[PDB]
Ligand binder design. Structure first.
Ligand code: IHP
Lengths: 122, 572, 836
RNA sequence: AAGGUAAGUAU
RNA sequence: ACUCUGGUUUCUCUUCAGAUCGCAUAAAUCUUUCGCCUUUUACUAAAGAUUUCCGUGGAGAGGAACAACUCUGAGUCUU
C-alpha cells in the first residue's frame, strides 16, 4: 500500500449549519514517508521534557538510551552519588504520595479536612 | 497552578463541575451588603512553596502585583520595569518547568517556524504539521501547464520525490515562480548545553554525557618549551588574577542554566506586560504535536498555527496617535467618582447596570411584552400577536450586547458562588475554564455574529491543546482542568474589537437624535445635473426662467440623436 | 582615516589574511568584533548579532555566509604598532568552498577558525589541506571558548585537554599535506590563538601574559608566554615553572594562570551579578557604571570581557609574526601562481613587490553594485600602483603571449578600498594591497590579470583559479516567457561573473544548464538570477548530477577508423586504468610536462609499466591533468615513428575532444587508457591535415571505448553529520534509505555529539539534508561535498531494459536509465549509434 | 436579527 | 583624598512615534478575487488599502508626594 503512495504522490506532483468541530479532512499531518511519519522525538540529552506533559509519565516513556549510556560510562564513585540522589528523591516522592492518597487508604479518625471534603464530594 | 490543578484532579476521582448558569433566571443579583461582604473567602489555589529551595520568591509569590511597593525590584506603584536578581529568576524558572519546553536552540523549528509557514502559504503547499491556506494567487490556468519539452517527464530522473519541505527549504531552487517567498534560517549551531541533575555536584563538572576526551599518548607531543626551572622566576606579588574568588558559587550552575532558558526567564530585568498579552500556551502549539495523539487535537494544532501565522503575517505597525486616555477624561468632568472596591462587588454592579441598560433598551417604544430576566434571556411575557412580534424586533447588535452581558453575568456569578462558599477554588477555576471553552453552548452569541465563530472554534482548539497536556499522566479525562487563561484572553481580544461597534450602536440609539446599484446610475445623473446647473447659472434667468426645462429637453434630444446615430443640428 | 591610506605605501606593514573555517565557527562574528574595536559608532545590538560582512539580503535571511567580504582596517599590535590588515571573511559552508579560493589566492595568510566545542570538522580539514596546497602560512584560532564553560561546564583541566586535542589534531592534519616542519602549531609558538567572538574575548599566550605584566609589572610577557602551555607547572614555593608537578594535584600553567581566571570571571558574571560581581570587578580593576550592571547576562559578559581584554592584540600579533607580508610573501605566491614562473624577468620584478614596478594586478572576485548592471573587479596588486581613470590592459584566462586576442584595453575609473559595508575612494593603490577596480568588468569573466598597456608586453597571465571540489549538480534554466530569453542569458552572464565555480553551458537541444556544488549553492544562484540580475520569471528543471563514462574490460577487437581522405588509418584499443592512477593524474602528482625519462620511471615504479611502453605515453585527456591517458603501442618496425610524430598533435587533440565528449550520453570520460596499436599516415604533408585526423581520432576513440565494456559513473558525495548520540540510528536509517552507507561513527571527544561520516550518491543527496534535519527534528545537521566518481550498477548499453516514466528504477536499471534520460536532456538520439 | 403586520368601519 | 553637583516616585495635560509602539493581537468599512448564493443585516477566505478599539515608547509642560540630604561625574583629588 505505502509503496504505491509514493508513486501516487509523484504522479500527482508531475501529472445554515455551525461547525464547532474541525473536520478531520482538514488534517495536514498525513505522510507516506516512514521518515516523516515516525519522526525521531528530541531526547534533550535525557534531561529535558516537553512542556505541559507530566514529568513522571515522560520519564517512563523515555528511550532509555541515555540512561544506559550513563549507567555504562559512570564509574562507581560517581554512581554512588547518583544512587543517593535517586534514593532521596524517591523517598521524598513516596512521602508525598503517602500524604496525598485516597480516603480508602485512611481511617476515619485520621481523616483531614481536605480528605473529609473529598469524601463528602464523592 | 498547573501543578496544583493536576494534583486536585488526580486525587479527586469524581469532580463536581459547576452548574451553569449558577443562579436562577428570575433571581435578582446578590447584594454586596449581606451576602459576600460579611462572609469570609475559602482558600485559593496556592502551591506549597518549599522554604529551602523556593526562598527568594516565597514571601511575595502569591500577592496581587508582587513586589509593587519594593523600590529595589519595581520602579513604583505604576508597576513597570521590574528588576530581578539571579536567585529569584532561577527560582521562578524552576517553578515554571511544567509550562516551558526544555528546548535549548531553535533547531527544533527547522521548517516549522514562522518563515517556513509564510513560504508554504505563499507557495500554496503546506508542511505536514503546518497549516493550510487558501492560495495567495489563484493562477489555476498556470497551475496546470502544458507538456513542454523543458518540463518533459520523459527527461526527468526520479530518485526521491520532491516533497513540500524540499520546496520550502530551498524555495528558489525547487519550484518555478517563487514570489512572496521567505528564506528561513539555515542552521543555528547545535547548542550543546548539559543541565545538571543534582545540586550536590560541582557547577563545572565533566558530566558522563560528554564523550571522554581520552588524551592519547601514542605520539609523544613535542613542543618548544624552555629549560625548566632555571631562568624564569615570578615576582612574589604575582598570582593568578582571581585566586581568592572561588571557581563556582552555589548560583553558578543556576546562573549558567538561566542563559539557556526561554525568553522571559533569560532576562535579568525587563518591562511589565499585561495579563492579556502573555500567551502561556503559545509555545505549546508552536512546537510539533506530540506523537500518539488523536486526529482532533492534531487538527487543533494546525488551526492554532494557522491563526498564529495569519496574525503574524497580516500585521501592520501601529499608527501614530496623540494619546488621548479614557477613564482620565471621565474623572475630569463632574460626572464620575473614584474609589476602590472588591472585584466581585464591581462585577455585581456592572451586571446590574447592564441589566438596567438592556431593560431601558427593551422598553424603548413603551412596549412591555418583552421581558429580560437576570440571566439575560429575552422572552415574551405572553403569547404575543404577530403585529407585536414585528413591533418588538431588535437587530443583531442588541442581541450581541445581551449575550456579552450574559457572559459577564456568568463569570461574575461563578466568582460570587466561589465567594459565598458554594464551590471550591479548584471548582471555580474549572468553571471559568468551561465558561471560556463553551461560550457558544453557554450563550449562543454566534447566531448574531458569525465571525465570532472564529473565536469559538479557537476556544475549543485551545482546549484540545490544554486538556491533552493536562489529562496525560495518572490524571484522566474529567471535569477538573481549570487552566482558563487562554479562553479568557481570547474573549478579551474579541472584546477589544467588538467594543467600538456596540458603543457606536448604543450611543446613536439612546441619544435624543437618531441617525440612519448606484455605481452605474451615477455618472449620467451627476453629469446632467452639473450641465444643467452651469447652463442655468450663466443663464440671465431674471427674464427667461421658463427656458430652463427646455434646456434639459435639448440635453435629451442630443443624447437621443447620438444614441440613434442620427444628425443633430439645432438651428436656433 | 588618512593614516590608513598612508599605511599602504609600506608593504612590510601590511598583512593579507583570509579567515577560513567550518560553517558557523565565528569568523563573521570575529570580524564584527574587529570592526567594533576599530569603529566607535558601530556596536551590535544586545539580542541580534552584528554580521557586518553579511551584506547580502540572502546572508541576513539564511544566516549563512554566501560570499567572501573584504575588510581593510588598521589594527594595533601588542606593542602598539598599528598594522594594516586586509581580512577576507570567507563563507564557512562547504558548498561555497570556491568562494574561499577566490579569497585564498590573493591572501598571504590563513586564519583557521575552529569551534571549541565542535573541533575539527569537514570544511576545516578541506580548508587546511587546500591552503597548504597554495603554500600559505596557517595560523589557528579556537573561537567560541565560552562553549567549554557556559555550555559543557567542563572542568578547567578538561577544557585544557579539549583545547590540546583540538590543536594536536590540526598538527596531525597539516603533516599529511605539508612537508615543511615550520607549519606546526602551538599557542606558545604564537601560531594558535584563543577567542570567543560572541563575548569579545581574544587572547593568545603572549597577550594574556602582557595583561599579567601590565597588572603586576616586572614580567617578560614573551618569556611568561613561553611557559603558559603544556605539561609545565607552577611552583609558588620557588615561584618557578617546573616540568614536574610541585604538589599532588598541581594544575598546569595554562589551567592555573589562563583558564582559571577566565572560568572565574565568566562564573561571576553569569551567576553572581548582584553579590560578588562588583567585588571581583574591583579586584580586576574593571569599573562598570550602575546602568552597565543593569544589562542582561550576555551583554554584561561581553562588556566586561571587552573591558578586561581590551583590543584584539593577540590576533594582530599572531598574524604579524606568522603570516608573511606581501613584500616577503610574494615569492612563493609568484612561484605557485604566475604561469611564467619566478625565473621570468617579470616574475623576478614581482617577487620584490615593488610599488614602482610594472603594473600587475590579479583580479579574483567580481562584486555587483546596488542596481546589478555594473560589476567591480576585486584583486590584489602585486607590482606597481593602479591609478583612477587610467587606461590599462586586462588579460583573460585564455590569454597567451602569442595571442593578444583575449586582452582588451579598458580605462580604470574610480578605485575603492573596500571594507565590508562601506568603501573609501582612493586615487592609487600600491603593490601588495587589495583593490576594487571599476571599469574593467567587461573583459573579465572569472579571473583576469591587469597590467599596463603599451609596455611590459612580455606579460603572461596568472594561473587559472583551482577549486577544491568539482561541481556536479546540474540544473536546466529557461525563461517563463521565451520573449525574455536574452535577459536570462544576460542574467546568466552576471551569475557567471559573480560565482567562481559556476558553469553556464548551452546544450545542443537549447537547454541552458548551470553547474553548482550543492542545494544551497544553487538555491542562492537562482535567487541572485531571479531577484537582482534577470528580474524576470524563470523556470527551473529538477536538479540532476553530471555523469562520466568509463570502461571495465579491454576492447574485444582492434577498432580502426579511416579519414575521409581514405589515406590515414588509426587502429586503437581501450583498457581501464589501475586503481588510483586517475586520481594521481587529477591530483597533479604527475604531469605530461615532466621530463620524459622520469615520467616513464613513475609508471615503472608505482605501476610497473614497461620503461619503453611508459615512455610511449603521448598525453593525458581531456585536459592536461585529465584522468584519461593516451599511450602509443605501435610496432616500431611497422609504423614510421618520425612520420607518426608529424600527426601526433592532431591525434592528441582528437583524443582530448573525444574524451571530453563521451559517446554514451555526451559526458566526460574517466579512468580509460587508449592504446594506439596501428597508424597508417599519408606520406604527403597536406593529406594528413588536422581537419581530417581530429574527427577520425575522435571516431576511433568512440569506437574503441564502445567496444570496451562501457559503464556510467555517478558522483558520490562525502557527508559528515554531527548529531546527538541518540540520533545516530536515525542518520543510519536515512542514509540507508537514500542508497548511502556509513563509513564511520565516532564520538566527538569533549562533547556528547557524534560525527557520522558516510558516502551517498549525489543524485540521491537532493533533500537528504532536509530529510535528516526533519526526521531528527533538527538535532542532526549534515554538510555534503563531492568526493569521488563511482560506477553505477547495471549495464548502460542494455537495450532490453524498459524504463517506466515516473518510477524510481531498481539498481540494475539505473545505469541504463541514467543514460537515456540524459541523452533526452541533451537532444541526442534515443540510443547509442555504435555504427556512427 | 429579519425577509411571517389582513385591511375596514365604531367608541 | 577634597568642594559643588538637587534627586526619585506619582497624578494630569500637549505633541511626536520610525521601532516586534505590542516578544501580544481584535473589529469595522472599502476595493478586488473566491466559496454559499436567495434579499438586506450577518457571512465562506485569501489579498490590498483604510478606520476604530485594547494597549505602548520618547519628549515637552503643569501640580503632588519630597524632604534633601546627597548619589554622581566634573577638579588638582590631599598625605
Ligand atoms: O471525547 P469527546 O466527546 O470528543 O469529548 C471531548 C473531551 O473528552 P475526551 O477527553 O474524551 O476527548 C473533553 O472531555 P474530557 O474527557 O477531556 O474531560 C471535553 O469535555 P469538557 O470540556 O466538558 O470537560 C469535550 O467534551 P464536551 O465538550 O462534549 O463536554 C470534548 O468534546 P470535543 O472534543 O468533541 O469538542
Amino acid at each position: 500500500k505505502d509503496k504505491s503512495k509514493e508513486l501516487h504522490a509523484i504522479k500527482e506532483r508531475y501529472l445554515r449549519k455551525f461547525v464547532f468541530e474541525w473536520d478531520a479532512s482538514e488534517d495536514t499531518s498525513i505522510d507516506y514517508n516512514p521518515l516523516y511519519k515516525e519522526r525521531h522525538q528530541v531526547q534533550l540529552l535525557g534531561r529535558g521534557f516537553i512542556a505541559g506533559i507530566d514529568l513522571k509519565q515522560q520519564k517512563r516513556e523515555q528511550s532509555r538510551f541515555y540512561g544506559d549510556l550513563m549507567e555504562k560510562r559512570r564509574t562507581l564513585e560517581e554512581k554512588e552519588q547518583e544512587e543517593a540522589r535517586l534514593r532521596k528523591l524517591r523517598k521524598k516522592e513516596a512521602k508525598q504520595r503517602w500524604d496525598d492518597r485516597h480516603w480508602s487508604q485512611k481511617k476515619l479518625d485520621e481523616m483531614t479536612d481536605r480528605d473529609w471534603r473529598i469524601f463528602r464530594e464523592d | 497552578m498547573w501543578i496544583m490543578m493536576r494534583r486536585e484532579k488526580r486525587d479527586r476521582r469524581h469532580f463536581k463541575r459547576m452548574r451553569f448558569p449558577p443562579f436562577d433566571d428570575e433571581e435578582p443579583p446578590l447584594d454586596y451588603a449581606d451576602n459576600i461582604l460579611d462572609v469570609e473567602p475559602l482558600e485559593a489555589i496556592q502551591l506549597e512553596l518549599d522554604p529551602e529551595e523556593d526562598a527568594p520568591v516565597l514571601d511575595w509569590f502569591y500577592d496581587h502585583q508582587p513586589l509593587r511597593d519594593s523600590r529595589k525590584y519595581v520602579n513604583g506603584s505604576t508597576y513597570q520595569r521590574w528588576q530581578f536578581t539571579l536567585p529569584m529568576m532561577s527560582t521562578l524558572y524552576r517553578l515554571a518547568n511544567q509550562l516551558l519546553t526544555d528546548l535549548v536552540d531553535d533547531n527544533y523549528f527547522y521548517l516549522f517556524d514562522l518563515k517556513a509557514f509564510f513560504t508554504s502559504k505563499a507557495l500554496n503547499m503546506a508542511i505536514p504539521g503546518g497549516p493550510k491556506f487558501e492560495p495567495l494567487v489563484r493562477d489555476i490556468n498556470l497551475q496546470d501547464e502544458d507538456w513542454n519539452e523543458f518540463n518533459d517527464i520523459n527527461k526527468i530522473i526520479i530518485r526521491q520525490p520532491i516533497r513540500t519541505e524540499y520546496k520550502i527549504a530551498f524555495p528558489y531552487l525547487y519550484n518555478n515562480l517563487p514570489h512572496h517567498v521567505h528564506l528561513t534560517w539555515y542552521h543555528t549551531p547545535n547548542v550543546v548545553f548539559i543541565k545538571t541533575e543534582d545540586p550536590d555536584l560541582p557547577a563545572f563538572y565533566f558530566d558522563p554525557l560528554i564523550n571522554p576526551i581520552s588524551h592519547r599518548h601514542s605520539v609523544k607531543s613535542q613542543e618548544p618549551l624552555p629549560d625548566d626551572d632555571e631562568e624564569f622566576e615570578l615576582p612574589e606579588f604575582v598570582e593568578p588574577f582571581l585566586k581568592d574568588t572561588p571557581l563556582y558559587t552555589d548560583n553558578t550552575a543556576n546562573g549558567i542554566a538561566l542563559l539557556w532558558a526561554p525568553r522571559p526567564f533569560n532576562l535579568r530585568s525587563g518591562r511589565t506586560r499585561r495579563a492579556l498579552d502573555i500567551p502561556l500556551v503559545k509555545n505549546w502549539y508552536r512546537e510539533h504535536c506530540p506523537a500518539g495523539q488523536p486526529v482532533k487535537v492534531r487538527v487543533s494544532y494546525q488551526k492554532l498555527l494557522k491563526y498564529y501565522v495569519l496574525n503574524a503575517l497580516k500585521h501592520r505597525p501601529p499608527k501614530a496617535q496623540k494619546k488621548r486616555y479614557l477613564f482620565r477624561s471621565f474623572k475630569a468632568t463632574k460626572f464620575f467618582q473614584s474609589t476602590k472596591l472588591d472585584w466581585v462587588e464591581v462585577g455585581l454592579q456592572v451586571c446590574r447596570q447592564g441589566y438596567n441598560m438592556l431593560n431601558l433598551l427593551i422598553h424603548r417604544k413603551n412596549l412591555n411584552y418583552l421581558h429580560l430576566d437576570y440571566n439575560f434571556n429575552l422572552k415574551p411575557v405572553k403569547t404575543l400577536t404577530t403585529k407585536e412580534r414585528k413591533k418588538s424586533r431588535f437587530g443583531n447588535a442588541f442581541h450581541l450586547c445581551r449575550e456579552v452581558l450574559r457572559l459577564t453575568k456568568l463569570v461574575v456569578d461563578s466568582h460570587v458562588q466561589y465567594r459565598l462558599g458554594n464551590v471550591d477554588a479548584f471548582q471555580l477555576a474549572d468553571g471559568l475554564q468551561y465558561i471560556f471553552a463553551h461560550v457558544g453552548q453557554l450563550t449562543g452569541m454566534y447566531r448574531y455574529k458569525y465571525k465570532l465563530m472564529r473565536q469559538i472554534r479557537m476556544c475549543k482548539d485551545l482546549k484540545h491543546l490544554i486538556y491533552y497536556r493536562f489529562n496525560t499522566g495518572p490524571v484522566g479525562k474529567g471535569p477538573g482542568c481549570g487552566f482558563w487563561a487562554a479562553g479568557w484572553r481570547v474573549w478579551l481580544f474579541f472584546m477589544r474589537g467588538i467594543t467600538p461597534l456596540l458603543e457606536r450602536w448604543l450611543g446613536n440609539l439612546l441619544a435624543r437624535q437618531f441617525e440612519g446599484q448606484r455605481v452605474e446610475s451615477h455618472f449620467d445623473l451627476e453629469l446632467r445635473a452639473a450641465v444643467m446647473h452651469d447652463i442655468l447659472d450663466m443663464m440671465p434667468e431674471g427674464i427667461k426662467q421658463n427656458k430652463a426645462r427646455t434646456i434639459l429637453q435639448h440635453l435629451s434630444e442630443a443624447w437621443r440623436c447620438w444614441k440613434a446615430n442620427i444628425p443633430w443640428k439645432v438651428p436656433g | 582615516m588618512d593614516f590608513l591610506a598612508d599605511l599602504m605605501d609600506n608593504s612590510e606593514l601590511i598583512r593579507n589574511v583570509t579567515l577560513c573555517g567550518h560553517l558557523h565557527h565565528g569568523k563573521t562574528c570575529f570580524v564584527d568584533c574587529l570592526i567594533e574595536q576599530t569603529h566607535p559608532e558601530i556596536r551590535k545590538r544586545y539580542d541580534q548579532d552584528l554580521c557586518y560582512t553579511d551584506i547580502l539580503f540572502t546572508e541576513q535571511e539564511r544566516g549563512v555566509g554566501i560570499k567572501s567580504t573584504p575588510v581593510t582596517v588598521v589594527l594595533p599590535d601588542t606593542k602598539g604598532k598599528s598594522y594594516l590588515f586586509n581580512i577576507m571573511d570567507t563563507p564557512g559552508h562547504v558548498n561555497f568552498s570556491d568562494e574561499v579560493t577566490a579569497g585564498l589566492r590573493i591572501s598571504d595568510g590563513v586564519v583557521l577558525f575552529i569551534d571549541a566545542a565542535e573541533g575539527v570538522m569537514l570544511n576545516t580539514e578541506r580548508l587546511i589541506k587546500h591552503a597548504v596546497q597554495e603554500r600559505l602560512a596557517v595560523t589557528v584560532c579556537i573561537n567560541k571558548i565560552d562553549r567549554l564553560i557556559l555550555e559543557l561546564k567542563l572542568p578547567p583541566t578538561d577544557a585544557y585537554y579539549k583545547l590540546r586535542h583540538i590543536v594536536d589534531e590540526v598538527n596531525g592534519l597539516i603533516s599529511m599535506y605539508s612537508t615543511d616542519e615550520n607549519l606546526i602549531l602551538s599557542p606558545l609558538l604564537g601560531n594558535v590563538c584563543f577567542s570567543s567572538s560572541q563575548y569579545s574575548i581574544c587572547f593568545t599566550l603572549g597577550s594574556f601574559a602582557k595583561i599579567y605584566a601590565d597588572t603586576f609589572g616586572d614580567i617578560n610577557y614573551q618569556e611568561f608566554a613561553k611557559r603558559l602551555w603544556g605539561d609545565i607547572y607552577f611552583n609558588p614555593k620557588t615561584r618557578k615553572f617546573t616540568k614536574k608537578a610541585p604538589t599532588s594535584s598541581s594544575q598546569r600553567s595554562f589551567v592555573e594562570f589562563i583558564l582559571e581566571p577566565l572560568y572565574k570571571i565568566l562564573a561571576q558574571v553569569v551567576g553572581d551579578v548582584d553579590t560578588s560581581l562588583p567585588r571581583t570587578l574591583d579586584e580586576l580593576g574593571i569599573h562598570l557604571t550602575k546602568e552597565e550592571l543593569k544589562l542582561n547576562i550576555r551583554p554584561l559578559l561581553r562588556l566586561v570581557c571587552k573591558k578586561f581584554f581590551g583590543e584584539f592584540t593577540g590576533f594582530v600579533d599572531m598574524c604579524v609574526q606568522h603570516i608573511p607580508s606581501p613584500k616577503v610573501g610574494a615569492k612563493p605566491k609568484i612561484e605557485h601562481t604566475y604561469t611564467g614562473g619566478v625565473d621570468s624577468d617579470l616574475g623576478e620584478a614581482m617577487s620584490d613587490c615593488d610599488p614602482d614596478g610594472p603594473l600587475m594586478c590579479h583580479t579574483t572576485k567580481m562584486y555587483s553594485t546596488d542596481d546589478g548592471v555594473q560589476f567591480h573587479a576585486f584583486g590584489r596588486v602585486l607590482s606597481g600602483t593602479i591609478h583612477a581613470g587610467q587606461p590599462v590592459k586586462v588579460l583573460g584566462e585564455n590569454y597567451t603571449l602569442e595571442d593578444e586576442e583575449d586582452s582588451q584595453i579598458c580605462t580604470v575609473g574610480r578605485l575603492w578600498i573596500s571594507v565590508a559595508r562601506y568603501h573609501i575612494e582612493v586615487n592609487r593603490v600600491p603593490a601588495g594591497n587589495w583593490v576594487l577596480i571599476e571599469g574593467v568588468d567587461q573583459p573579465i569573466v572569472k579571473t583576469a590579470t591587469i597590467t599596463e598597456p603599451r609596455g611590459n608586453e612580455e606579460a603572461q597571465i596568472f594561473r587559472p583559479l583551482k577549486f577544491n571540489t568539482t561541481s556536479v549538480i546540474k540544473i536546466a534554466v529557461e525563461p517563463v516567457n521565451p520573449s525574455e530569453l536574452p535577459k536570462m542569458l544576460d542574467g546568466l552572464r552576471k551569475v557567471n561573473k559573480s560565482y567562481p565555480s559556476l558553469t553556464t553551458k548551452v546544450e545542443e537541444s537549447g537547454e541552458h544548464v548551470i553547474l553548482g556544488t550543492g542545494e544551497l549553492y544553487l538555491d542562492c544562484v537562482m535567487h541572485d538570477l531571479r531577484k537582482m540580475y534577470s528580474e524576470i520569471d524563470i523556470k527551473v528543471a529538477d536538479p540532476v548530477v553530471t555523469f562520466c563514462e568509463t570502461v571495465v574490460e579491454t576492447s574485444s577487437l582492434k577498432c580502426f577508423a579511416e579519414t575521409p581522405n581514405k589515406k590515414n588509418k588509426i587502429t586503437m584499443i581501450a583498457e581501464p586504468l589501475e586503481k588510483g592512477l586517475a586520481e594521481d593524474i587529477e591530483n597533479e602528482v604527475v604531469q605530461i610536462t615532466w621530463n620524459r625519462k622520469k615520467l616513464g620511471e613513475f609508471f615503472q615504479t608505482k605501476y610497473d609499466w614497461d620503461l619503453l611502453a611508459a615512455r610511449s605515453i603521448w598525453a593525458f585527456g581531456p585536459d592536461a591533468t585529465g584522468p584519461n591517458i593516451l599511450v602509443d603501442d605501435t610496432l616500431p618496425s611497422e609504423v614510421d615513428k618520425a612520420l607518426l610524430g608529424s600527426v601526433k598533435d592532431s591525434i592528441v587533440q582528437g583524443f582530448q575532444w573525444g574524451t571530453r565528449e563521451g559517446p554514451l550520453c555526451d559526458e566526460l570520460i574517466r579512468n580509460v587508457k587508449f592504446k594506439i596499436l596501428d597508424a597508417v599516415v599519408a606520406q604527403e604533408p597536406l593529406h594528413r591535415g588536422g581537419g581530417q585526423i581530429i574527427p577520425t581520432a575522435r571516431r576511433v576513440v568512440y569506437s574503441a571505448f564502445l567496444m570496451a565494456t562501457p559503464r556510467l559513473m555517478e558522483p558520490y558525495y562525502f557527508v559528515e553529520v554531527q548529531a546527538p548520540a541518540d540520533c545516530v540510528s536515525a542518520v543510519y536509517t536515512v542514509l540507508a534509505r537514500r542508497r548511502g552507507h556509513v563509513t564511520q561513527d565516532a564520538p566527538i571527544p569533549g562533547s556528547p555529539l557524534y560525527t557520522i561520516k558516510a558516502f551517498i550518491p549525489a543524485i540521491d543527496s537532493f533533500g537528504f539534508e532536509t530529510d535528516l534535519r526533519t526526521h531528527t527534528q533538527g538535532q542532526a545537521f549534515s554538510l555534503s561535498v563531492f568526493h569521488h566518481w563511482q560506477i553505477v550498477p547495471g549495464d548502460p548499453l542494455d537495450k532490453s531494459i524498459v524504463i517506466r516514466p515516473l518510477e524510481p528504477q531498481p539498481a540494475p536499471h539505473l545505469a541504463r536509465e541514467f543514460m537515456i534520460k540524459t541523452r533526452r536532456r541533451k537532444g541526442l538520439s534515443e540510443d547509442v549509434s555504435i555504427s556512427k
